[PDB]
């Protein structure tokens, strides 16, 4: 009972300190920057071959190779330039919710409702793709696998916790706890030393991969957070929730900078991605179309559209040349 | 596709696509059903021809040249709103209710109410199974059907009591284009597969009728 009072006063101290740092909103300082106009993006490629809903997609580090997981139980690696299928990996469980690509192109980790993160080796001497390691230890559905190196991966689950794994040994090196709801997404910072995870408790909190410490927590959303992605400089991140609102939080100021809500938007955000410059905030919505937000003025700088069903995944190449979108209509479209 | 190496890469892609289409053909002869219900309600012992295969449990019994795949979602112990949309394309929903449990009956009704009126399952027909007729028949004599349902007013006979429970479950439908196929089952019933088969065939006709434009 006494500690409960201590908990409350600590929140008041944080709120007062957080409010005292606020001097001017982001939309008030950059009011003199000229708008970026209309970003009209045209479909350049249409990747077909999936026979079920597409739930995840990750870009290769060379901005040419893609990976996509679907309910059909197939894992396809695409040549994004010539639309050729490089690999086709049959999964054990057809219920895959996330699917990641290694930064070196050697491995691919891709898992889901089976509570297991399966890692596949592409550069094998036998010419086929084999299941190198199956990571187990999560009691809930898996989401947002992210490779750190060729032998280190961070995973998120519905156990209200995320885990840091060692692919060689197979043991859970570090476990990050503190969430009070299913964790739906995570993103790795460019300096590969920090990451943020968005959970169902309407809170995203910054975690340290080396120490396993919740350095900071961020609030403001009214519903569960569905997606997250860092600003390109690794000093801010953007979240997407079922509240049909996008928000930009700053790690140094510990306060949200601006909101990306529009009166015509009803359905929540599914995916969040940034451009190479950090100016266009692309977000996928449940009303079958993606919107491009000017991340500095909260102005809709065009709409992608085109898809027939809910857009479930977004992806921007490392060089920023194209944007890949996946939806439940079993089609991947590449925009530019 | 100009270079010699790129010509073989295109040949590899076309060979991959052939197997992708072939696997899709073999994935159209199976019926995907969803198992739901409270614990200890017989949701794992409906058909004695199991041929099963913590998390998701599959069951792939076959009947009359048709493949039935049953997905048991129990044991996840997570928020259903985040992964129940994966089963948006299931043919039907199989719900199991235990008539001898007077305490979990209200818990079962909450489960049925949430699932039936879910936004993803607004058109998926439900095959509702009422289990353990004999156990319920003996239980009602010892304790009347009034502690669980204080609003009951009809005769204390088995026929009226069992039908009264059925009416409550169908009172939660509240939607068109959805039909609830009920059936009373016991422990020593072998024709559960036959009951599922005729309901699934009946559900397919309704969806085909809407697609053809007749209705």
């Amino acid at each position, epitope marked *: 009972d006494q500690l409960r009072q201590e908990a409350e006063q600590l929140k008041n101290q944080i709120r007062d300190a957080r409010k005292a740092c606020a001097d001017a909103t982001l939309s008030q300082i950059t009011n003199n920057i000229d708008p970026v106009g209309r970003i009209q993006m045209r479909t350049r490629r249409t990747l077909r071959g999936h026979l079920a809903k597409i739930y995840a997609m990750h870009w290769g580090t060379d901005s040419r190779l893609l990976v996509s997981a679907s309910q059909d139980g197939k894992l396809i690696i695409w040549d994004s330039y010539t639309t050729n299928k490089v*690999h086709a990996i049959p999964l054990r469980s057809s219920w895959v919710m996330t699917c990641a690509y290694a930064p070196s192109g050697n491995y691919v980790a891709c898992g889901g409702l089976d509570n297991i993160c399966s890692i596949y080796n592409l550069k094998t001497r036998e*010419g086929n793709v084999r299941v190198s390691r199956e990571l187990a230890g999560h009691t809930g559905y898996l989401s947002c696998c992210r490779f750190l190196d060729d032998n280190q991966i961070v995973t998120s689950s519905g156990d209200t916790t995320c885990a840091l794994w060692d692919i060689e040994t197979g043991q859970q090196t570090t476990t990050f706890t503190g969430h009070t709801g299913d964790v739906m997404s995570l993103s790795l910072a460019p300096d590969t030393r920090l990451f943020v995870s968005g959970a169902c408790d309407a809170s995203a909190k910054l975690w340290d991969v080396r120490e396993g410490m919740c350095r900071q927590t961020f609030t403001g959303h009214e519903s569960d957070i569905n997606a997250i992605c860092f600003f390109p400089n690794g000093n801010a991140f953007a979240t997407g929730s079922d509240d049909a609102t996008c928000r930009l939080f700053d790690l140094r100021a510990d306060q949200e900078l601006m909101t990306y809500s529009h009166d015509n938007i009803i359905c929540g955000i599914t995916s969040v991605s940034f451009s190479k410059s950090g100016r266009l905030l692309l977000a996928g919505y449940d009303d079958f179309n993606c919107n491009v937000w000017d991340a500095l003025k909260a102005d809709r700088a065009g709409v992608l559209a085109g898809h027939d069903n809910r857009v479930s995944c977004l992806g921007v190449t490392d060089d920023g040349m194209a944007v890949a979108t996946g939806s439940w209509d079993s089609f991947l479209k590449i925009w530019n | 596709t*100009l*270079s*010699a190496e790129e010509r073989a890469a295109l040949e*590899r892609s076309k*060979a991959i696509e052939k197997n992708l289409k072939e696997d899709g053909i073999s994935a159209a002869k199976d019926v995907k059903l969803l198992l739901l219900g409270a614990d200890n309600s017989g949701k794992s012992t409906i058909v004695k021809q199991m041929k099963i295969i913590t998390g998701i449990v599959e069951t792939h019994f076959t009947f009359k040249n048709l493949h039935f795949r049953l997905f048991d979602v129990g044991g996840q112990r997570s928020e259903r709103k985040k992964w129940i949309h994966c089963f948006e394309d299931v043919t039907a929903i199989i719900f199991c209710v235990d008539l001898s449990d007077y305490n979990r009956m209200h818990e079962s009704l909450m489960l049925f109410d949430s699932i039936c009126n879910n936004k993803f399952f607004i058109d998926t027909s439900i095959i509702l199974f009422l289990n353990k007729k004999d156990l319920f028949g003996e239980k009602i004599k010892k304790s009347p059907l009034t502690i669980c349902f204080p609003e009951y007013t009809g005769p204390n006979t088995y026929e009226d009591a069992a039908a009264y429970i059925q009416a409550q479950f169908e009172s939660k439908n509240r939607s068109p284009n959805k039909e609830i196929y009920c059936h009373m089952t016991c422990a020593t019933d072998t024709n559960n597969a036959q009951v599922i088969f005729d309901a699934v065939t009946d559900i397919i006709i309704a969806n085909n009728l809407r697609g053809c434009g007749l209705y």
Partner: single-chain antibody
Amino acid sequence: DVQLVESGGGLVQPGGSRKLSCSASGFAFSSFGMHWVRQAPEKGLEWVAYISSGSGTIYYADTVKGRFTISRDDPKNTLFLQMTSLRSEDTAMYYCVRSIYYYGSSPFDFWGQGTTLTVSSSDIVMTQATSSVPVTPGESVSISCRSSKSLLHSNGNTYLYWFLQRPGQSPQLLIYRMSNLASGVPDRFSGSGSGTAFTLTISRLEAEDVGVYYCMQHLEYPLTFGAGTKLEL
């Protein structure tokens, strides 16, 4: 362990027919394209025929076009080469090579052990400057060969392959496009080039690097090898 073994060699009379079998054990044979390469006595390597994965696309060399035939038995993991009429030119050590083609693949990594066949009594021309180069260990060696056309495709890839045939062994792939090191080769090897002139450099040469070096083009069929540069110590 990847292993290709060939059998069916021997002494045959002119005008007869022989069949060579290449049984594979250690890799997914059904996904690889298999070539036949023959090496005449102390003359050099020469491409013969190629069958694609799934027996879809089949090619033959102009020398033995319409005379040889290639067949593929995927369930048995065996590759055949039936020769109808044999002259005195057919005598050579026939090798069996696997090849897989996709974005970023290595289509000439593994060569078979080779079988010896003895018989009793337009195209891209690649030329190697020299035939014998004496050198001592620790000295960098540069090997260069030219070509008729420009192997640099419009896609940005240059189709040049460098092989090393140690004495008494089978050729081993070192560089497969212009500078892409093969799997398991030492990092001291490096390659470069510009369109029609290419160079292979070996820094900090070791005693086991001696042998005959061949440069081959894969821009267009038929495949043509170089004259062959021999390193002496």
